[PDB]
Design a protein around this ligand. Sequence first.
Ligand SMILES: O=P(O)(O)C[C@H](O)Cn1cncn1
Ligand SMILES: O=P(O)(O)C[C@H](O)Cn1cncn1
Ligand SMILES: O=P(O)(O)C[C@H](O)Cn1cncn1
Ligand SMILES: O=P(O)(O)C[C@H](O)Cn1cncn1
Ligand SMILES: O=P(O)(O)C[C@H](O)Cn1cncn1
Ligand SMILES: O=P(O)(O)C[C@H](O)Cn1cncn1
Ligand SMILES: [Cl-]
Ligand SMILES: [Cl-]
Ligand SMILES: [Mn+2]
Ligand SMILES: [Mn+2]
Ligand SMILES: [Mn+2]
Ligand SMILES: [Mn+2]
Ligand SMILES: [Mn+2]
Ligand SMILES: [Mn+2]
Ligand SMILES: [Mn+2]
Ligand SMILES: [Mn+2]
Ligand SMILES: [Mn+2]
Ligand SMILES: [Mn+2]
Ligand SMILES: [Mn+2]
Ligand SMILES: [Mn+2]
Lengths: 199, 199, 199, 199, 199, 199
Amino acid sequence: SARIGEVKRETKETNVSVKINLDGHGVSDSSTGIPFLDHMLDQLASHGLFDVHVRATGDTHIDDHHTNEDVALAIGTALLKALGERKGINRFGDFTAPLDEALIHVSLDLSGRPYLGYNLEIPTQRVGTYDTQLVEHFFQSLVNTSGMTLHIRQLAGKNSHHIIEATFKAFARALRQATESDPRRGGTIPSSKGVLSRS
Amino acid sequence: SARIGEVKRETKETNVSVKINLDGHGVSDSSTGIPFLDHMLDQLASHGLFDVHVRATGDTHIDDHHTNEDVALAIGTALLKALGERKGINRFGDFTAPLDEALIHVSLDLSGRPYLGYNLEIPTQRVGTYDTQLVEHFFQSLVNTSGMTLHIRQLAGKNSHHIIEATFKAFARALRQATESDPRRGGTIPSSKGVLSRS
Amino acid sequence: SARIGEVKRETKETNVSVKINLDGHGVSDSSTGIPFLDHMLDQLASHGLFDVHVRATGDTHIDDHHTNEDVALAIGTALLKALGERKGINRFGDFTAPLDEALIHVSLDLSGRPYLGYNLEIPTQRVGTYDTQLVEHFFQSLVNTSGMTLHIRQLAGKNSHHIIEATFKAFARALRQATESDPRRGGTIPSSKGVLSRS
Amino acid sequence: SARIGEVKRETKETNVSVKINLDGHGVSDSSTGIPFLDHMLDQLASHGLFDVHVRATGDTHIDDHHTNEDVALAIGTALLKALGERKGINRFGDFTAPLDEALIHVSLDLSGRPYLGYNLEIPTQRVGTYDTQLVEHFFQSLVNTSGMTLHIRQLAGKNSHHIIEATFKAFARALRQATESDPRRGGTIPSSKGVLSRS
Amino acid sequence: SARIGEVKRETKETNVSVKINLDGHGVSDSSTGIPFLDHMLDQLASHGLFDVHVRATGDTHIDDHHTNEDVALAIGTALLKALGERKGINRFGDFTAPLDEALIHVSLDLSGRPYLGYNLEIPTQRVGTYDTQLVEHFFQSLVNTSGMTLHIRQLAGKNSHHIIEATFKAFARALRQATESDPRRGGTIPSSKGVLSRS
Amino acid sequence: SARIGEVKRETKETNVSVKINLDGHGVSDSSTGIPFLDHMLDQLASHGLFDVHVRATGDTHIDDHHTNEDVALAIGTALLKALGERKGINRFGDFTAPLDEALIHVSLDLSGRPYLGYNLEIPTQRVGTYDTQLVEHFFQSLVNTSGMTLHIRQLAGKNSHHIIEATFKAFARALRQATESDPRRGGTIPSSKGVLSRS
Ligand SMILES: O=P(O)(O)C[C@H](O)Cn1cncn1
Ligand SMILES: O=P(O)(O)C[C@H](O)Cn1cncn1
Ligand SMILES: O=P(O)(O)C[C@H](O)Cn1cncn1
Ligand SMILES: O=P(O)(O)C[C@H](O)Cn1cncn1
Ligand SMILES: O=P(O)(O)C[C@H](O)Cn1cncn1
Ligand SMILES: O=P(O)(O)C[C@H](O)Cn1cncn1
Ligand SMILES: [Cl-]
Ligand SMILES: [Cl-]
Ligand SMILES: [Mn+2]
Ligand SMILES: [Mn+2]
Ligand SMILES: [Mn+2]
Ligand SMILES: [Mn+2]
Ligand SMILES: [Mn+2]
Ligand SMILES: [Mn+2]
Ligand SMILES: [Mn+2]
Ligand SMILES: [Mn+2]
Ligand SMILES: [Mn+2]
Ligand SMILES: [Mn+2]
Ligand SMILES: [Mn+2]
Ligand SMILES: [Mn+2]
């Protein structure tokens, strides 16, 4: 049966709803109020094969920050819920993807333990209307609620849209791999300590 | 009524029990299987005025790592449970404490959002039998489950025991401050967004 | 009786009204025409417990500069009026607050003597639509009319919104401390020279 | 039929027995007299899905060196025996795995030709009682008897236990991949020269 | 009952009398024969709320050194006597105070263990007739007899009078904090080892 | 009549007893629970000709730190008591001693004024089980209670045991010299100010 996580999250700053199917067919349905982020979430669906449903509204007149953050938090929680006990999964994901001159390595472990290693150097401040500082924050917030160890490494790149989009493509493929069933492990928990937890 | 958090946490590596009273009288009752850590937890009680009850066993024949980590995780969860909705608290804590030549600044925010900034340079590898790398890991794990933003800055120090112990003293006082009641805010949540959460 | 300062200030560039209660309950009521600034003033209320009422209009088609400046001037005057002779207060405030990876130290003295020490390095030029140069100018103008010695020190930070917001949180807490009653000094002026003045 | 390699190896320094199933279910059964090494061998089973049976005794009063070395030699021989002619396998393995802040890339070729490329910089001398120089020696000895080309690259890391354990996790996954059946090659030897040999 | 320490100290170089009330109302009554020092002691009273009574005479025709030193020694002894067993106190003090462009951080621990960490760089040799080397010596001598761990850190400053005076203001506030009653600790000794002593 | 100082000192961490005869015959009787320290105290007796009786127990399961410190404190107090008014003594001591390649200069003044200047660079972290950071702490604590100005300068050395032991030999000889009777001064106090005191 498909692993689906659903989240509603609201504060005085933002209102967010997320539904993610780990066992999806790449259904893309993201509307965050941040068009560039929507385009990136579309890569998560197209390349990760997640079904990604996101709705957000928020205080974008202040800046895109709170929206971006709260979307990421809610996505991370949806991943946590869908993953459950993490029985029988690959756990680890590793993929390097390009977009033209950009080349980004993503490695992750669905350990339960939040950590972000990130070294992107995005050479412009705005891609469309999107503040490029928010990319790091998206991943940081997502790892915090999902209980993910995540490394993002820039191997090459100059165009900011290419750098960011290659990151999402690599992330999508690494996350797909990690969430997928391990065909040899017979449904067992993939941990020598017998459990995977965010606590 | 006193804010008390209780946690039991067990894996194939370790077995941990924690009870913390935020509104304590400094009752010290820590036995982790790591004597140096016990001594540090005793500062948390003595200077923070938390009642700190900790029991742990684990795979110390491998190394103190898993025990140290899992104690920290469980303490963080106990803090999270005791704090609840975080209504009426100071939220922020800030304190710099010495131990002789050592001087350590600790600043924290009980935001719900885990983050550790840490720059200690502990010049020896073992204090007694305790691996000095485990200090950073203790705080990292604790912030992750407690939902704490924490900065630890070494301003001076040479003796490893002094550096580490001053850190725990400063942390204890900053955490005390942050967890204490704000006498002017009338029980309100100390956040412009109306909520403080680890999600 | 509550210490309240009220200011109306108008030029050909801007029109500003401010009312601040030093002895407030954190009532937030700021509308400057600069949404990011409103969000920052909201931290001043939430964390400083000032009641902050601000209205401004101005020549934002030129840039946010004159508005930002004139709001700050008027706030400083409101603080000066509310403070009066400064009898019985703590006078000094000192607080370091984080926002995730950002960490900002604010120290101030309600001496009457305007001074700003500031070393923020905000790595992007715009947070939303807000020009990040205007942060320094806000504090500079505020100290000039309030008669405040103010130091703002960036200890850590990368995200521009985090850096700026941590600054306002630290400032709010330091200003709260400084303006609050000193419970031991018996209503006396906190100065060896017998007076505190902007002249 | 499952590919199983069994080795008994004894000198005046050590006594070692190894049994490895390449086509295992992750059965972990390692007791080397070096607890940290046992914990690492447990990752080899848990993540590589090898059945790993190891027993060793030896001159640990001198140091763990001879034991560590001779265990590695015997494991390498067991791999060589189990692999046989290396018909129909993937041959190459490539995986990057993290453990929190640590990130280690392992690439290997089951060519028959021993080579170790290794650049770990493990910042402490002892993890528990285990001498961290012995990690490099473990892999060097293993490649020598197994006939493996192996590269181990530290991409990130600070905690010695994390660095070493991430290495074993990445190694386990790369070795799993390399030893597994290539579903398209129809049982053929994966070499343009028609043979894979340690001679 | 108020904690008062009284000292008479005389040598062939100097004659000194000190009386300090830890629980004072800021009574300033210092006449050392060194006017600049008197002005600084006046800050100790005004901002620390100590009652400070000092009389000294000495060999100022040689230089202010012996007087400055012996005043400091006697003040430290008076603090030691007044503090007694140090039951129920905060123990630690931490405060950063400015004077215009100067900004000085003082952190102290009333541990019993004398230590001075000091990094002031006072850019002129004389403030009035007062030799600016004597500032460091004042604090060094004071810590030695009081049994105080003391750190003084220059964060900013150019004017020598500002640097020195900000130091005394910060020191006064940190010492006030440390000597004050801890309202939660119920009169207990604030030390995990059960005693605070200069021996 | 022989100058003998006796001290009992106990906390929750340690229990210490010291008896020192300044006018001894080199009777060595030290048992601190730290064998390396005992060996060093034996040099103090053998080369200084002090009769040195020390007993300590303490929390060595945490580390040797508290024991080492408290032994030093108690020895310093015993020296202070035995020295009394310091009439008729040499006061100053100066000696440089080698141990093979190591060469250590010790200069001291029995002034009453505690100060340690120390520049040893001991190239290993443990000599036997003894943490080499504790050497500096031993001397620092000793000067604090004895009222000694002490300089320790490493002129040469590589072997940690040689460096430390040469330090104790030089210290022993310098202290012997300083404590011995000045045969020309006729019992007078060796100070132009007419008194030597720790206050
Ligand atoms: O990665 P896991 O949790 O499956 C097993 C590890 O042994 C736990 N660990 C966490 N830090 C060091 N080791
Ligand atoms: O600190 P908070 O959550 O009370 C309010 C902040 O506005 C939320 N925030 C988080 N990142 C930037 N802003
Ligand atoms: O800070 P104050 O004004 O209370 C007293 C100072 O002595 C005045 N001052 C100003 N510059 C140097 N000293
Ligand atoms: O990797 P192989 O042995 O399958 C084929 C290679 O051509 C052999 N070789 C070894 N060095 C250079 N080439
Ligand atoms: O600061 P204290 O004396 O309350 C307790 C410390 O454990 C004693 N100590 C002194 N050096 C290292 N530890
Ligand atoms: O060394 P003493 O105490 O005998 C005499 C000195 O004159 C006192 N002194 C202390 N600092 C400077 N001089
Ligand atoms: Cl600082
Ligand atoms: Cl790479
Ligand atoms: Mn944020
Ligand atoms: Mn695109
Ligand atoms: Mn770990
Ligand atoms: Mn201690
Ligand atoms: Mn302007
Ligand atoms: Mn915000
Ligand atoms: Mn070897
Ligand atoms: Mn492990
Ligand atoms: Mn002097
Ligand atoms: Mn002045
Ligand atoms: Mn110590
Ligand atoms: Mn020897």
